Every structure is written in C-alpha cells, then in structure tokens.
Amino acid sequence: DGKPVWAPHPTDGFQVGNIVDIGPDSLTIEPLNGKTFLALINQVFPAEEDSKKDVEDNCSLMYLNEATLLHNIKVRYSKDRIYTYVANILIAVNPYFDIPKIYSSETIKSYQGKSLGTMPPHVFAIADKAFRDMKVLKLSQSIIVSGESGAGKTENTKFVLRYLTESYGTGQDIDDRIVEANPLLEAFGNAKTVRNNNSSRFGKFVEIHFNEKSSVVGGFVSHYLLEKSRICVQGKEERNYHIFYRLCAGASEDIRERLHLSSPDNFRYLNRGCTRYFANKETDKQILQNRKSPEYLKAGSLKDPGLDDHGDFIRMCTAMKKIGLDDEEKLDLFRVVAGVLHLGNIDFEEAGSGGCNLKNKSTQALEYCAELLGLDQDDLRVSLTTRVMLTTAGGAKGTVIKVPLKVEQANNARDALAKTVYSHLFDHVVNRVNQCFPFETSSYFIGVLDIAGFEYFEHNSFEQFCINYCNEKLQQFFNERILKEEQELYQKEGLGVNEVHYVDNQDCIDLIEARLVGILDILDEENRLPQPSDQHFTSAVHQKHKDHFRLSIPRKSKLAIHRNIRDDEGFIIRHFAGAVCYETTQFVEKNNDALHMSLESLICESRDKFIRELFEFISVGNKFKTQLNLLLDKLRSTGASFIRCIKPNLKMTSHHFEGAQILSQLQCSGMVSVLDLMQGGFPSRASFHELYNMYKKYMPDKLARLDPRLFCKALFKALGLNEIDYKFGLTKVFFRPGKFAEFDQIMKSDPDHLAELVKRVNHWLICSRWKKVQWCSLSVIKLKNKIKYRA
Amino acid sequence: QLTEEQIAEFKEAFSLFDKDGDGTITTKELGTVMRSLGQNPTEAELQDMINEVDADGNGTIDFPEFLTMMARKMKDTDSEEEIREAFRVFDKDGNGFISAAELRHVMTNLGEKLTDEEVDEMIREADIDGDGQVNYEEFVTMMTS
Ligand SMILES: [Ca+2]
Ligand SMILES: [Ca+2]
Ligand SMILES: [Ca+2]
Ligand SMILES: [Ca+2]
C-alpha cells in the first residue's frame, strides 16, 4: 500500500521511499525526502516498519533481505554493537576503536559453554561453538572468515585464539607466540595492492591443536596459494612483497654492499610497480638517499599510520630475534631475496649464429646473482639460455641433447627460477614460524582461515580470475554448510518434511575447472598449438560454451566501459557475487611458469647449504586448481563456522558507516547468496519469549499469564494460520519468506476479529492446559519408575 | 512405540520441564518438576538416568532423549496404572476429587500463574456428566482429547 520500501542510493546503498508508479521492469520511487527516480524491481525491497528496531539475529526480522540486513547492522553499529548474527553466521563490523569491556577476562568466562542463541552476538560465541562441537563430535573445526584487507580480520583471529587459549589452554600462551611472528609472515606474504596497503597474498589457516581431553597442546600455520606472479611484476599502483622494500630502505650500508642493493628503480622485479616507500616525515630522514628511487624523490613517500618500510624492517629484525632466528639465518634469508632481485636483471639477445646469449650489460647481474645463490656464473649462463631434452618420448632408447632457448624462453626460465626460489623461501619462513609452537601429537584442531575475497576492477585479468574462482568454490562450500545447518535445524525443531530448493553454482565452477572442456584446460590446450594466442583461446571458450548460462561475450555487459571489447578479447562470468568481465590479453603467458629441469637441478645443488635445504609440466591455472582443492579437502574434513568481517569506511574512522561500501562487501562476501539460499526454507523465526513480549499487549490478561510457549500455541491456534506458511517448532515459530510481516498485520489490522478469534480458542486452551500438567504428572511418574527399573 | 498424538502431549510436558525454553532439559530442571509433584530423587539417581539416554553426549536431554527416558518394557495393566497414579497426584487429601484449591495445588507447585476464577473454569470444562468434579472416566476423556 503506502508501506516503506528500500530502494537504491549511491552512497548509503539503500534509502527509504514509497512506490508511486510501476513499469515493466522498474518502479518509480519517491524518497521519503518529489525527486522521484527509477529502480529495477529486484533492487527494491520491503522495509521493517520500525526504523529504530535492532535485533541480534537478522532471522528475527519480519523481512530478511540485503537492505533490511544492511539497516539492522547500521542501527547496531551506531550503538557500538559490532556483532550480529544471521543464524549461526557472525557479521563483524570493524569499530576502528578499542571497545571497553567486551574482550575482558570476565566476558571470556561468560561465553564458556553457552549456546550461541543465549548470549549477545560475539566472536567468542563462534569460538566456543567450534570448541564444543570439537569436544563432543570428535571433529576438527574451521572458522572461515571473509573480508577485505583491513576489515578487522587480523584482530578477529587474535580474539578467537585468545579466547581458545585462555579458556581451554593450560597457562601456555600459544596465541601470543603465533602473534609475535606476524612481522615475518607479512614481510614475505603481504604486499601493497591498488586498494590495500597491507594485503595478504596467500591463504592462511591458523590452527589451534588439541589433545583427547580437549586441551591446547600447540599451533600450526598452514599456508596455501602464495601469489607467484607478483614476484616478477606488478602494476603501477602495486608493489612486490614488503620484504624487498624493507630490505632496500632499512638494511645497513654494510648489508647493502654485500647484497649489492640499490634503490628499487634499478630492479626489473620491482620497477614496473610503485617504487615508493611507506614513510613519514621522521622515517624519511632515516633512509639513505641512495635507497630512494626517482618516483619517491618526485612524488614523496606513501602514507599509512601503521606501515613503514624502514621501521618495519627493524621490527621484522626484532621479531626474528624474539623467536630464535639467529643473525646468520637472517642474512641467509636476505641473501636469497637479493639473489632473486639480481636474477631479474639478467637480459638476453638473439644469437643468430641458434638461440640466445646473456647480454653483456648483464654480466654484473649474473655475477651478483650466481654469488648470492651460490652458483657458477657459467653454469647459470648456460642453463638460462639452454635446456636438456631426450631424443625420444615413448620408451625407445634415447640420447640427451642440448637445446638452445629463444630469448622469450630464456626470460621465462629466469622468471620461473625467481618464482620457485621465492616460493620455497616463503615455505621456509612459515615452517620456521611453526617451529615456535611445535607439538608432539594432537587429536583435533580449530583453525581460522584468512584468504583474499572476491574482487573486480575496471580491468580484470588472470589474477582476478583465479581469486574469483577460489571464492566461487568457497562460496559453494559456504552454501552447502548453511543448507545442511538449516535442514538440520528444521528437523530438530520438529517442522516436518520440507525441501529447501537449492540452486547450486556447480555450473559456474564446471565452466572454469572441468577437465578438457573447462576454461583452464582450454587455456592449457592453447599452449600446444603452433601459434598460441589469447584471442584463439578466448574464441575457443565461447565456441565450447555457446549455450552456457554463466558465460557471455563482453558486448552483452550492462556497462559502457565494455562496449568496445571484442568477442575474442574477453569474457563475462556470472559469479555468485555478480557478473565479472575479464579481459583475456596475457592469459596464455600468465598460464606458464614452468622451470626446465636442468636449471632447477642447478639451483637444487647450490654451493650454499641454506639454498639446498630450501629445495628439500603443469600450468599455473592447474597448479592453482590443485592447491585450491587441497585447501577445500581440509575445510571439507572439518565442522565449519562462518564470520563476515566488514570494513565500515576507507578512512580508518570510527563511527562512520558507509552504506554502499558495506553493501558491496555483504554482496562480495557471499552473504546475499546465503540470504537467497535461506528464502527456500524458513528464514524468519522468533522465539516464544520474543513473540510473547511483542504481542501480549493485544491479548486479554488471561493469556498474558500463560508461559510463552502456551501463549503462542494459543495465539497460533486461535488465528487459523495456513499450514504451509507457518510452522510451530520446539523453541520458535518459523515463517516462510514475508510471512512474519503478514502475521504482524493480522495482529494489528482488525482488533474485533482478533478478540473474537481469541474468545473462540478458550476451550482448546483450557484443555491444552489440562493436558500439559496432566501429562507432566504422568511424566514425573514414569521417571520415578525408570529409577525403579534398577530392580 | 508411542503414537502420533501421545508424542505431541509429552512435548508440552517437556515444555514444563524446560522452563527457560532452550529446548534442552538439565538435571536441575528435571528434579524441580518431579519434586514439585511430591518426589525426592537424588543428584545421583537423575544423572544416571540422563547418561543411560544421553546418546548425542552433550550432557542435556532433548525431546528425543526425553521420550526414551519415559519408555520401558511393560504390560497394558502396568501402563494404565500410571494413568491412575497420575489421577491421584491432584487429589491432595485423597477423597476421590480434585477441588479448586487442589487442582490449584498442582498449578502453583508446577508454576502456572492463574486466578481462582480461572481454576474454577478448568473444572467446568472437564465435567461431562455435569456434577462439578472430574472422574477417571472424564480425566481420560480429557487427557486423551
Ligand atoms: Ca532448558
Ligand atoms: Ca543429549
Ligand atoms: Ca481432594
Ligand atoms: Ca464429572
């Protein structure tokens, strides 16, 4: 009628309005502030009538949709209530200030053993549910956290580990040891991206390990999917891993000369990216002028209140000390890092004698690289420009021949080697970190996952494709687990038989990863052809998947920026979070990073023993798939709980809820997908106590005196509610979508009808109340007897 | 074992035990109700009764558990003797009849908040023959309604 709806607003996400006209596909909205505007019908949502209402669980809303969720969490955020549930899913909005009281020892103790529904929403309740299910089901647990870099994820993990160790640990502070090491993990696994100064580029699963008595014995950091492409190249607003800049900004002149470091504009592996340091007025004065690149001198430092290349170098050194890394192992790490940097400066020129030679201007780079990595310069020169092959492939006796590489193959061998070295170094840093909280054995674990979420830009390339693929698969895992929890809840509540209609995203997943016919195998097939081309790869995808629901040519995009992208220059995939247009230029080169065997053997038998120890045919996309599947196998072997961390604005400001930005994160985090899944079941539900308090004011005193369950049984029975839309559970009334709003209107719209209906339920209610105490007497007698069964 | 309707009645009994409405019965909740109906089990006798039936292992009784806790092997003569001891729980003095202060006696003990005019009305609803008190015939009619 004249009811409030939510309609789109460009900075708040949604605004309140009235529907004043209708059209075929859109609605005309009058903002509650006569500047009408048009909105697509599926972007307009019913609003709660009470705009100052706040519920702890969004399932208590009379309408559960993206707009009512956004508003409920906004209202809660304005009262510093940062935590809110959707069923068992925790939504967590970063406060950007230290909230008094809620993380104290007293609060920790108050959450122990308590069911999720029985305390206010809190990260501790999610930690405690994981624990109880671990103890009772003898099942390891995962706590799967989504969010942008900086969305409070680091602090969230800290609270979980602190809750678990302080509650269920024995004076041993695993949480603090894990945390002391962070400067080292971030140095090797974090980097500046266009949106995030301190973005983690790997999947990290922080496990607290437990014995059979469910007491903490230790911790383990599992790591997955380090982003390899960033090692050799970056876009102009991005950097390589922090370590490279900390080392160049902060290393003493003695270490500089030994590693032959110089400002980062001098390194191919740094100089396509942003070569500027994070520095403030004081730390800038501590960086020698010869560490500073031209872009730095012209443009100044990058500004961040919590990151500084010079000072973070010192902090990283302090943490390496605080956890046992001796100074020789320190310099070993640094030697490998600078070895990789000099590797990247080696250039090649076409021979024309066949193959290529190292340019003569690359002689010092080669000299530096071979020394740092402990390799003969001549051996390196040869393995960079030539490879070994057998003269046969199919069992016949063959000979080893030497095959000169072209320049392009030599560029690839130098970069492949760079990537394998750095990745093994990362693997080493993490193992070393794990050597700070080792444990003999354990029966189960509770782990917290942190991994880059779904993202898109104006230009999306292979990096985005892999990240969004990873998230498509995690989203399927999230949907499956929520589906299972809801089905289980409906059974435990006694709601009877019900199918929750599930529209899966297996088809999107199959589009990307299916053997032979998936986009990643079609991309590998492109490598085998005479003249590999991105355009041919892309036409093949469109040809093979002509009829695919989740694939479109770029031309079909709603956006203007994709207007002139050709059919063979990109594709659109319809992900869980929305449509993404990928430009496929460079997909083929980005799909190859293989290191030919002779060069890998060279490095595996470095003169230097540290390098040797580091090291003790498949495309990038298929290695990505394989490692992602290993991550998923782990998650699938645990009970799962879910936290969605939300960044309230881009300015680190307290008390500033930016609606559109938060909306976009709720979409990208898979919350809206989850809400869509929940519409197939009973997404609104309310406890008898909640219903009793809302509606007793409308009932005779006779009814107000009933306990909440019999009050509701009475009201439910008196109204003659349709058996499909309304379900009377054990502890709650469950509603089909919108049906709680409809219940509320019945309760409000005709007092005389209501009064009469309640009059007429009198008899049924007298009896129900007879039978309650009656059968409760009969139950006390049966119990009394069961104790007598011992006879 | 139990029929459709009989399961439904014990769920409402279950609600009398589960005062806080979390869908779970604790040892504390279990004894109170037995006590309030003139019973005296020990914190040892109850826990042993929970453990025999606490399959899922979480240290509290859900409705499924509750029902198995009711049940045992017995004859159709021993079962309807339970019904008669139930019929004898309300009648405080023992004169074959539940008075308003007596039907009211179970109520307050049970924790049902009502008024005397309400009590008197519950009586009037069960009285089939019209006398003004409730006979085992009626009791079973009512209980089994
Ligand atoms: Ca209870
Ligand atoms: Ca149990
Ligand atoms: Ca009597
Ligand atoms: Ca009678």
UniProtKB/Swiss-Prot annotation, chain A:
Residues 1-49 form the Myosin N-terminal SH3-like domain. Expressed in all tissues examined including kidney cortex, intestinal mucosa, liver, lung, heart, jowl muscle, brain cortex and medulla, and in the epithelial cell line, LLC-PK1 (at protein level). In the kidney, located to the brush border of adult kidney proximal tubule cells. Keywords: Actin-binding, ATP-binding, Calmodulin-binding, Cell membrane, Cell projection, Coated pit, Cytoplasm, Cytoplasmic vesicle, Endocytosis, Golgi apparatus, Hearing, Membrane, Motor protein, Myosin, Nucleotide-binding, Nucleus, Phosphoprotein, Protein transport, Transport. Residues 642-649 are annotated as: Actin-binding. Its main location: Golgi. One of its GO terms (molecular function) is microfilament motor activity. Residues 53-748 form the Myosin motor domain. One of its GO terms (biological process) is actin filament organization. ATP binds at residues 147-154. Residues 269-313 are annotated as: Responsible for slow ATPase activity. Homodimer; dimerization seems to implicate the unfolding of the three-helix bundle region creating an additional calmodulin binding site, and cargo binding. Component of the DISP/DOCK7-induced septin displacement complex, at least composed of DOCK7, LRCH3 and MYO6. Able to function as a monomer under specific conditions in vitro. Forms a complex with CFTR and DAB2 in the apical membrane of epithelial cells. Belongs to the TRAFAC class myosin-kinesin ATPase superfamily. Myosin family. Divided into three regions: a N-terminal motor (head) domain, followed by a neck domain consisting of a calmodulin-binding linker domain and a single IQ motif, and a C-terminal tail region with a three-helix bundle region, a SAH domain and a unique globular domain required for interaction with other proteins such as cargo-binding. This is Unconventional myosin-VI. It comes from Sus scrofa (Pig). The gene is MYO6. The chain holds residues 3 to 815 of 1254 of the full protein.
From Swiss-Prot, chain B:
Ca(2+) 1 binds at residues 18, 20, 22, 24, 29. The record marks 113 as: Not N6-methylated. GO terms for cellular component: cell cortex; centriole; centrosome; cytoplasm; cytosol; midbody; mitotic spindle; mitotic spindle pole. One of its GO terms (biological process) is detection of chemical stimulus involved in sensory perception of smell. Ca(2+) 4 binds at residues 127, 129, 131, 133, 138. Residues 5-40, 41-76, 78-113, 114-145 form the EF-hand domain. Keywords: Acetylation, Calcium, Cytoplasm, Metal-binding, Methylation, Repeat. Ca(2+) 2 binds at residues 54, 56, 58, 60, 65. It comes from the Eukaryota. Trimethylation of Lys-113 observed in other calmodulins is absent here, but does occur at Lys-92 specifically in the compound eye. The modification N6,N6,N6-trimethyllysine is found at residue 92. This protein has four functional calcium-binding sites. Two alternative gene models exist that generate identical translations. This is Calmodulin. It comes from Drosophila melanogaster.
